[PDB]
Each structure stands twice: as structure tokens, then as C-alpha cells.
Design an enzyme around this catalytic site. Structure first.
Site, PDB file in Angstrom:
ATOM      1  CD  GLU A  65      -2.997  -1.011   0.571  1.00 37.22           C
ATOM      2  OE1 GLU A  65      -3.817  -1.869   0.447  1.00 37.22           O
ATOM      3  OE2 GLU A  65      -3.070   0.141  -0.039  1.00 37.22           O
TER       4      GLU A  65
ATOM      5  CG  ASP B  11      -8.349   3.999  -3.640  1.00 37.31           C
ATOM      6  OD1 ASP B  11      -8.973   3.414  -2.811  1.00 37.31           O
ATOM      7  OD2 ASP B  11      -8.881   4.232  -4.772  1.00 37.31           O
TER       8      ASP B  11
ATOM      9  CG  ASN C  19     -11.233 -19.666  -9.124  1.00 35.96           C
ATOM     10  OD1 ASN C  19     -11.621 -18.970  -8.157  1.00 35.96           O
ATOM     11  ND2 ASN C  19     -12.078 -20.086 -10.064  1.00 35.96           N
TER      12      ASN C  19
END
EC number: 3.2.1.17
Length: 164
Positions: A11, A20, A132
Site C-alpha cells: 500500500e 487510491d 482461479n
């Protein structure tokens, strides 16, 4: 390496309100302030969050205190969630950090929606699950971070972060 260092890598750290990747008002270490388009609504949430008139700027210490709360909240969220808890309980310590990372980023609800991936993780089918998880808006939008998290689930080691 630990969950804190890991998330601090993913982050970054910003001492002034910023937008963001989705365009939302954030500050510190990935602390979402508001989904609202108003900088003014953001500043107001910020002051409420910190307990002082910040004027859109906070200290390192303040950022870290917000970070500590958010990590705590992420863990507690998983522990309280009926879809997440069992996966978490089933995982080794490194992979547990990977699930916390997803939850911190996308929220409990969000992660709980990855039904199939969750089942695969639970069954310890690492490769399958990695494939996946990559079939998601998540992977498509923030592929660099998504690849690091996925690698962590695939290997059960901190390799992806040892680089960084």
C-alpha cells in the site's frame, strides 16, 4: 517478514490525502476515508478518524495508529465471518497473511465472494486456486499486487516480497 511489512509494501505510506487506485480518498497506509467525491467529505472523515483538525495532513505516528487498527479490524472480520473463518483456520501462517491482505484491500464481503477460490484454498489445491483467483476484476485492476498475493498462496513462502 510479517503481515505489517507485507501490507506496508503493497500500500505504501502517504502523509497527505490522496486518491487510491479506484479514485477514492485515502491517507496513510491504504486507509480508505470515503467513497464520496468530496474532498471536503474526506477531510471531515479524516478529522473524525484522528480526533484533531488535520487539515488533510497527518504525522507518521498517526498513519501507523490507523494502520494498527485496520489490521486488527481485518483479522477480527475474518474471525467473525462464517465463510472466512474456516479457511483461515485451515491455513498455515504465511497463507493466513495472504488472506488478511485481500481482506484489508477489498473488505470481508468482497473476499467472501471468491467462493470457488476459498474452497480450493481450503482443500490445499494451490495451483488450482492461483489460477482461479487470477480470473477476477481484482487481478485485472491491480495485477502487480494481485500477483504477489497469489504467489504467496501458491508457494506458502514470502518469495514475492523478498524482492521488494
Amino acid at each position: 517478514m510479517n503481515i505489517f511489512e507485507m501490507l506496508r509494501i503493497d500500500e505504501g505510506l502517504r502523509l497527505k490525502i490522496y486518491k487510491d487506485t479506484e479514485g477514492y480518498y485515502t491517507i496513510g497506509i491504504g486507509h480508505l476515508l470515503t467513497k464520496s467525491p468530496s474532498l471536503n467529505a474526506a477531510k471531515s472523515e479524516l478529522d473524525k478518524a484522528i480526533g484533531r483538525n488535520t487539515n488533510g495532513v497527518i504525522t507518521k505516528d498517526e498513519a501507523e495508529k490507523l494502520f494498527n487498527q485496520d489490521v486488527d479490524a481485518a483479522v477480527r472480520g475474518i474471525l467473525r465471518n462464517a465463510k472466512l473463518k474456516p479457511v483461515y483456520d485451515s491455513l498455515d501462517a504465511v497463507r493466513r497473511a495472504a488472506l488478511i491482505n485481500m481482506v484489508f484491500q477489498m473488505g470481508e464481503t468482497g473476499v467472501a465472494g471468491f467462493t470457488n477460490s476459498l474452497r480450493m484454498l481450503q482443500q490445499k489445491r494451490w495451483d488450482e486456486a492461483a489460477v482461479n483467483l487470477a480470473k477476477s476484476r481484482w487481478y485485472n485492476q491491480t495485477p502487480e499486487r494481485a500477483k504477489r498475493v497469489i504467489t504467496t498462496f501458491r508457494t506458502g513462502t514470502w518469495d514475492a516480497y523478498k524482492n521488494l
